Paper text:
One such pathway is the type VI secretion system (T6SS), which in many bacterial species functions to deliver antibacterial effector proteins from the cytoplasm directly into an adjacent bacterial cell via a one-step secretion event. In contrast, DUF1795 proteins, also known as effector-associated gene (Eag) chaperones, interact with so-called ‘evolved’ PAAR proteins in which the PAAR and toxin domains are found as a single polypeptide chain. Crystal structures of Eag chaperones in complex with the TMDs of cognate class I and class II effectors reveal the conformation of effector TMDs prior to their secretion and insertion into target cell membranes. Given that the Eag chaperone dimer creates a hydrophobic environment with complementary knob-hole interactions for its cognate effector TM helices, and interacts with TM helices via side chain to main chain hydrogen bonds, we conclude that Eag chaperones provide an environment that mimics transmembrane helical packing to stabilize prePAAR effector TMDs in the cytoplasm prior to effector export from the cell.
However, the EagR1 homologue SciW from Salmonella Typhimurium crystallized in isolation and in the presence of the N-terminus of the class I prePAAR effector Rhs1 (Rhs1NT), allowing us to determine apo and effector-bound structures to resolutions of 1.75 Å and 1.90 Å, respectively. We next compared the conformation of the bound prePAAR-TMD fragments between our effector-chaperone co-crystal structures. Interestingly, despite the abovementioned similarities between the SciW and EagT6 structures, the conformation of the N-terminal fragment of their bound prePAAR effector differs significantly. In the SciW complex, Rhs1NT adopts an asymmetric binding mode whereby the effector fragment does not make equivalent molecular contacts with both chains of the two-fold symmetrical chaperone dimer. The first TM helix (residues 19–33) binds to the hydrophobic cavity of one SciW protomer whereas the remaining hydrophobic region of Rhs1, which consists of two anti-parallel alpha-helices connected by a short 310 helix, occupies the remainder of the binding surface. Phenylalanine residues F20 and F43 likely play an important role in the asymmetric binding of Rhs1 to SciW because their hydrophobic side chains insert into equivalent hydrophobic pockets found in each SciW protomer. A lack of interpretable electron density prevented modelling of Rhs1’s entire AARxxDxxxH prePAAR motif in our Rhs1NT-SciW co-crystal structure. However, the DxxxH portion of this motif is part of a short 310 helix that orients the aspartate and histidine side chains such that they face outward into solvent. Our structural analyses suggest that Rhs1 residues F20 and F43 play a critical role in its asymmetric binding mode because the aromatic side chains of these amino acids insert into hydrophobic pockets present in SciW that are lacking in EagT6.
Numbering used by the authors:
A (entry chain J): 8 to 57
B (entry chain I): 2 to 145
C (entry chain E): 1 to 146
Amino acid sequence: DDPIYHTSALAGFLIGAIIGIAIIALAAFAFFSCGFLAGLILGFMADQIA
Amino acid sequence: DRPYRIQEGCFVLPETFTDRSVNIFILEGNERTSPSLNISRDTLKPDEDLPAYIDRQIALMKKNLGQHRVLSRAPAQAGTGNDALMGEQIAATHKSGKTEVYQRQAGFIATPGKVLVFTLTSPRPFDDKADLLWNTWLAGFQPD
Amino acid sequence: MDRPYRIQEGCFVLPETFTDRSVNIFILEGNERTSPSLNISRDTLKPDEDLPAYIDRQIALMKKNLGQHRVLSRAPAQAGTGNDALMGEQIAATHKSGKTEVYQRQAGFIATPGKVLVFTLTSPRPFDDKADLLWNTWLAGFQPDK
């Protein structure tokens, strides 16, 4: 059930759309898109639509 | 044993892996005020062709994003000449609080069952520069 | 101007002013339980920052942004084999996600001057022999672009 380890809807157009808005609107995304924290990027993305 | 290529080199993976990589390109230091590019992947459901997949993606974005609006949908092409990929593109808007973004997204079947998606995002309505970037980006793609 | 950029599916041209923040994500299939996943990310070294200092900064970022981040080990790491192999550093570390303890290995390497390449394995349960072999098989098979 966890998108970090399983296929999910966080793919394709949906993740592409979320990534774009996050870059502009969420300062924290700069940290979750590089370095060690990026290992959990899909967990961060899931939280943006929950 | 399966090879995989990234910009920095190549390696091998387990045979049954699913690629959910997201390529992300930003103008650093102006990330909130400049266009960004990203590339994502997806897998078609059984008996699901690309038009039905995009139908499904549009509904997912309306359900999960803020005031998602699809303004247009039209054919798209990734690459040029014999090796080009056919697909569809949309132009859309959605919001996160009082911030509105503008996006163009195009999806293509790269290999059987596998979708490749290109997304351009801007914090402002697309000007001529942003339209040029969109078209040069897609036209320059060379499938392996 | 526009420079080439390579992905699994092909290549394209990218204006040289764009910084690459791609995150590769590889979802593996489980057996009786959920399987670890693999991830590759990028970063930029600060001026006069060496790799150990960069790793320190990353550990601090994980501590600030996650729950109960705990380093279990830190040691040298190697990406690839032969003359072109990259020498770097790795950690093993856990953190809490809801009610569950997540296990990670993360290794950083200076791939090109000023540029860090990070390899990550994430598991919802303690490492086992299978997960350890995956980690070392993956790192050993990396072939840097020459």
